[PDB]
Amino acid sequence: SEPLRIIWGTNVSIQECTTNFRNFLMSFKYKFRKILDEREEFINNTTDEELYYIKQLNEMRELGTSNLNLDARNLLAYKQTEDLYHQLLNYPQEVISIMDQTIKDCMVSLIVDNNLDYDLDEIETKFYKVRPYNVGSCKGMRELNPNDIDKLINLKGLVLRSTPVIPDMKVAFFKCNVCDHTMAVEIDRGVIQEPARCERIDCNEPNSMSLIHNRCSFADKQVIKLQETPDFVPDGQTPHSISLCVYDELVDSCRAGDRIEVTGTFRSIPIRANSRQRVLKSLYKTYVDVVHVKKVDLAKIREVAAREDLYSLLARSIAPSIYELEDVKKGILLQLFGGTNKTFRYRGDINILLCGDPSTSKSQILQYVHKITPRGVYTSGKGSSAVGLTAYITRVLESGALVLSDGGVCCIDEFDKMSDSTRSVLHEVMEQQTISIAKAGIITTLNARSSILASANPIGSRYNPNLPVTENIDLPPPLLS
């Protein structure tokens, strides 16, 4: 009688999928997860008795936010829904599309059946989404193979780079050249289902209907190139990498060089042999289509700020392994806070040099400061070219250790054996907090604004105490001053 809806190729009923997931998405107490893993001694009334996804959805409504995260193991925790976890892993694109809509049905039921006073169109207009995560065991990018096409997979990696955002068309917009009538045409599997004729029966002209690009509607696509994590590599060779497409609200989740864990459907597509024909290469380009990404009080101030010993406490706790050197600790501490700043000159940046034999822990202090400091960079005197420490122009800003650390400690070691062309970088930074450049049409100034912590050795043998500090570092007084 009812024309049953079935996921293609599966013998899975979409009504049973929906009417199970609804009855998980409410009535799931978090108690059930603490039965699944046990730890069942730990059960706490306040969290564990609450209807977990009810509280999540009431938050979504009031924040006006459209995305529900879902740890897939909850589906196994609840008796009715164990087989849905297996459907979610095996048939992601359809099972996620059922979950997306069930959220939207629930959001409406939670106000209209509950007869609560709120704006309905504010919910009806939203594209709600599930973002499933914790889906299964992670696997090596190198362990992927064609058995996995169209399944949820869980990967860990390092982001190499992102493309700038790509507009992906979601609704084409067409206009009749003869009659000015217009249509929203639905994009389907990336093909525009173009009309043959004007939709107005009073016009009905063939071929006169035409596309208007800036009246179409678009989604946001971004390619991330993701490298294999160095823990996973077979040690005989290089890491691999995989491209992944991140979509809609997940665009710019990641900076370059983030470690991330991703959940996505593993995809393959044919690619054209030649851009003028439909002839396709017999081995397919592969990527992951991601659905989730994961990375990698005042009274406590008063506990410290009232204290008698305070300055000595802070000094003895910024670097607690380091033996004595108490006045070095005491001054470095003031460099962390800094002085004061004004606009309408001088600024609250502070600069410190360490000098003495290479045989002592002073470099380890330079390490602790890099560990404690907001922002900041660690480098050394021989450690780059001058333009590699300041800035340069390329095939477009190259930026170095002396920049991108406003109010942050620029740690530098080996400062005595920095090359003099590279010493001659610092006067504009240390005296005016700023840099100037002009090349290839660019005329520009850059704000450097770093508190420098420098470290230096004696040239050659042990530092003699009779002879002066200017000589014994071989370093120019107007930079030392």
Partner DNA sequence: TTAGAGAATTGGAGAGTGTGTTTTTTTTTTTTTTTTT
Partner DNA sequence: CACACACTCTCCAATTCTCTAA
Among 79, 189, 278, 342, binds DNA (CB under 7 A): 278
Among 103, 226, 386, 403, binds DNA (CB under 7 A): 386
d(CA 266, CA 288): 5
Among 79, 276, 345, 439, binds DNA (CB under 7 A): 276
Among 1, 11, 45, 340, binds other proteins (CB under 8 A): 11
> Stretches 37-45, 151-159, 275-283, 435-443: which one binds DNA (CB under 7 A)?
275-283
Whole-angstrom CA distances from 198 to 177, 186, 316 are: 9, 16, 81
Does residue 395 bind DNA (CB under 7 A)?
A: no
Q: CB–CB of 85/24 below 8 Å? A: no
φ/ψ of 138, rounded to 5, equals: -60, 155
Q: Is 450 annotated as a binding residue?
A: no
Among 152, 446, 452, 454, binds other proteins (CB under 8 A): 446
Does residue 464 bind DNA (CB under 7 A)?
A: no
Contacts of 341 (CB under 8 A, 6+ apart): 347, 348
Among 77, 107, 153, 176, binds Zn ion (CB under 5 A): 176
d(CA 472, CA 161): 46
Q: Is 358 annotated as a binding residue?
A: yes
Does residue 397 bind other proteins (CB under 8 A)?
A: yes
Whole-angstrom CA distances from 458 to 89, 225, 353, 462 are: 64, 46, 13, 7
Tokens of 353: 């040099």
d(CA 28, CA 50): 8
- Per DSSP, helices labelled H in 2-126 are 14-25, 33-36, 45-48, 52-63, 73-77, 82-90, 92-112, 121-124
Exposure letters 295-334 (e unless 16+ CB within 10 A, then b): eeeeeeeeeeeeeeeeeeebbeebbeebeebeebbeebbe
Give which of 424, 417, 414 is closest to 379, Cα–Cα.
Answer: 414
> Stretches 73-81, 84-92, 316-324, 419-427: which one binds DNA (CB under 7 A)?
419-427
> Stretches 31-39, 271-279, 288-296, 302-310: which one binds other proteins (CB under 8 A)?
271-279
Does residue 10 bind DNA (CB under 7 A)?
A: no
Shortest Cβ distance from residue 65 to other proteins (Å)? 22
Does residue 256 bind other proteins (CB under 8 A)?
A: yes
421 contact choice in DNA, Zn ion, other proteins, none (CB below 5 to 8 Å, kind-dependent): DNA
67 contact choice in DNA, Zn ion, other proteins, none (CB below 5 to 8 Å, kind-dependent): none
Among 4, 45, 117, 236, binds other proteins (CB under 8 A): 236
Q: CB–CB of 222/262 below 8 Å? A: no
Among 47, 93, 385, 464, binds DNA (CB under 7 A): 385
The amino acid that residue 392 corresponds to is Y
Q: Is 132 annotated as a binding residue?
A: no
157 contact choice in DNA, Zn ion, other proteins, none (CB below 5 to 8 Å, kind-dependent): none
Does residue 436 bind DNA (CB under 7 A)?
A: no
d(CA 449, CA 434): 7
Given the DSSP bridges, would you call strands 217-228 and 182-188 parallel, antiparallel or unpaired?
unpaired
Shortest Cβ distance from residue 9 to Zn ion (Å)? 17
Among 179, 192, 223, 352, binds Zn ion (CB under 5 A): 179
Binding site for Zn ion (CB under 5 A): 176, 178-179, 181, 198, 203
Annotated binding residues? 356-363
